[PDB]
Design a protein around this ligand. Structure first.
Ligand SMILES: OC[C@H]1O[C@H](O[C@H]2O[C@H](CO)[C@@H](O)[C@H](O)[C@H]2O)[C@H](O)[C@@H](O)[C@@H]1O
Ligand SMILES: [Ca+2]
Ligand SMILES: [Ca+2]
Ligand SMILES: [Ca+2]
Ligand SMILES: [Ca+2]
Ligand SMILES: [Ca+2]
Ligand SMILES: [Ca+2]
Ligand SMILES: [Ca+2]
Length: 187
């Protein structure tokens, strides 16, 4: 919901922020502290949350643009170089009441929360790895609050957090079909 004097862009995606640093990102706490420490180095619309894979540091050159792919045309600016970097996404996702679970492929780590509750966590650096996370429940159909963090400490980078509504038989990417930046219906 609106919570200040600034009108908010309504689009079918999450509000994306990118942060770079020349310090080491080892875990979720490090990345969250980076987010807390300054304004975003760039903003974007996260409408197709399947990013990478690439090499040679997400925070260098045009690697962020390549990583974000179809979402990079919404970047507010082209960040300068850093050694380490990551993204913070926030907004809403339409989900019917029921049981769900994430399955996430990533390098490095990440955390996804729904309605404020962590539902997928990797609190460390890693080369590309896929985790099938534990199931969670949605009590009431509608737009659920969601946020994500992901980072790259260096090297390769990928982030694809897929969701299953059918007990792990099929999974889907979070994209413009169901995302909303504000919780209003995007057209
Ligand atoms: O430790 C997390 C990183 O792992 C990889 O990078 C390490 O492993 C590579 C292959 O063994 C080495 O070449 C590299 O020097 C190591 O840092 C991965 O490539 C990174 O993206 C991960 O962040
Ligand atoms: Ca606002
Ligand atoms: Ca900030
Ligand atoms: Ca750049
Ligand atoms: Ca892509
Ligand atoms: Ca685009
Ligand atoms: Ca690093
Ligand atoms: Ca990496």
């Amino acid at each position: 919901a609106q919570d200040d004097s600034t009108p908010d862009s309504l689009f079918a995606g999450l509000v994306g922020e990118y942060y770079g640093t020349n310090s080491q990102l080892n875990n979720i706490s490090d990345f969250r502290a980076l987010v807390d420490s300054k304004e975003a180095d760039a903003t974007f619309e996260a409408a197709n949350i399947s990013y990478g894979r690439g090499s040679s540091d997400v925070a260098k050159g045009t690697h962020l643009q390549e990583f974000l792919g179809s979402d990079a045309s919404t970047l507010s600016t082209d960040p300068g170089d850093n050694t380490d970097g990551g993204i913070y996404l926030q907004g809403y996702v339409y989900l019917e009441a029921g049981t769900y679970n994430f399955k996430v492929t990533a390098d490095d780590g990440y955390e996804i929360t729904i309605n404020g509750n962590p539902v997928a966590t990797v609190d460390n650096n890693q080369s590309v790895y896929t985790v099938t996370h534990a199931s969670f429940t949605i009590s009431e159909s509608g737009y659920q609050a969601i946020d994500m963090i992901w980072w790259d400490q260096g090297g390769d980078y990928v982030f694809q957090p897929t969701l299953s509504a059918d007990g792990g038989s099929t999974y889907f990417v979070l994209d413009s079909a169901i995302l909303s930046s504000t919780g209003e219906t995007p057209y």
